[model samples]
Target: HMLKSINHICFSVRNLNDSIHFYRDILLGKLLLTGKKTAYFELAGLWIALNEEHFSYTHIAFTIDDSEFKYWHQRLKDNNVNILEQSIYFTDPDGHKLELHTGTLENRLNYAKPHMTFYK
Candidate 1:
């Protein structure tokens, strides 16, 4: 097995406090750690970290089970969250793009394995 699953994802933000609230208060990620320059959160069992700075990304997607999929979209929409690139795309407090989709590690990994070339 290679690249079995995502271990964590780290990104940069301008303000740690705002990002903390965004993740904890809005996005509902559990707070893990916080410091002057960095903050951490647990979202859907994935580790996400934020640092103080400006940054960009192609995008990162969060996987949710089908039961929670519509609820997430409704919650985000009900709060007037901006959606880009269609209904599934949105930027976090620090402008890190994110996508809310459905699936877990088991299913996702099965599809990923066939498409990946690993080093021996």
Candidate 2:
């Protein structure tokens, strides 16, 4: 069945603690580590979760405006986050590949990392 907005995205991280650092410390994913078994990234209106050995083969993307995208791209670069050749992708500590695509609602759905991608 075709669905609505995503309620949550689960990833089987190598270790919950490491994931927490990557998502929270490095990527700045909000740590709602009080009532959950994983890290949560409250990006946009969705919840991204990094669980333990639940789902490892994971990758996500996000959509953003030109200005927002540029800001994040530069910021991530300054932070020493490996910026992609096209200025729209990066790799995580655990080798998680992420991408950003600029679109006008015609683009597909995906994950958008902070300081890597943004909403215009």
Candidate 3:
């Protein structure tokens, strides 16, 4: 099939324990899938994933509303989190890079109204 949209983003991590804690604990991401050498987080309209590997520049991004953006920014600052010059780029415990931005379109098919309902 031809590429229509982004399905998900995956990365490689050096330490699963620390990466899991960073995403699940601090970021509060919902776990959608997991395995001995991999993990996935359910992001709005997309997904974030990880695979056990040596540290590298694994980049991923997320979109958020202005309110959530402010909340995350302040929270990161309060915790002394290491952020880039723009304050929107940060690294997970395993050095996987992450970005936060806004104004991205979301195609949440599950929330769409049905055209017609057939009752049995």
lDDT of each: 0.78, 0.65, 0.73
1 or 3: which has the higher TM-score? 1
TM-score of 3: 0.66
Candidate 2 runs further than 4 Å off: 15-18, 25-28, 34-37, 53-58, 105-120
- Please name the candidate that would achieve the greatest TM-score relative to the true structure: 1
Model 1: worst 10 consecutive residues (lDDT sum): 104-113
Per-residue lDDT of candidate 3, residues 1-102 (tens digit): 899988878777888787787777678778878899999987565687889884454566677776688898987777666787822888776566777875
What is the Cα root-mean-square deviation between model 2 and the actual structure?
8.9
Query: Where in model 1 is the C-alpha error above 4 Å?
Result: 1-5, 54-57, 85-87, 103-120
Worst 10 residues of 2 by lDDT: 104-113
Q: What TM-score does candidate 1 get on C-alpha atoms?
A: 0.70
Count of backbone clashes for each model? 0, 5, 0
TM-score of each: 0.70, 0.62, 0.66
Reference-based TM-score, model 2: 0.62
lDDT (Cα, tens digit) per residue for candidate 2, span 6-74 = 788776666777667666765556776533455667764568877666224665776666767767776
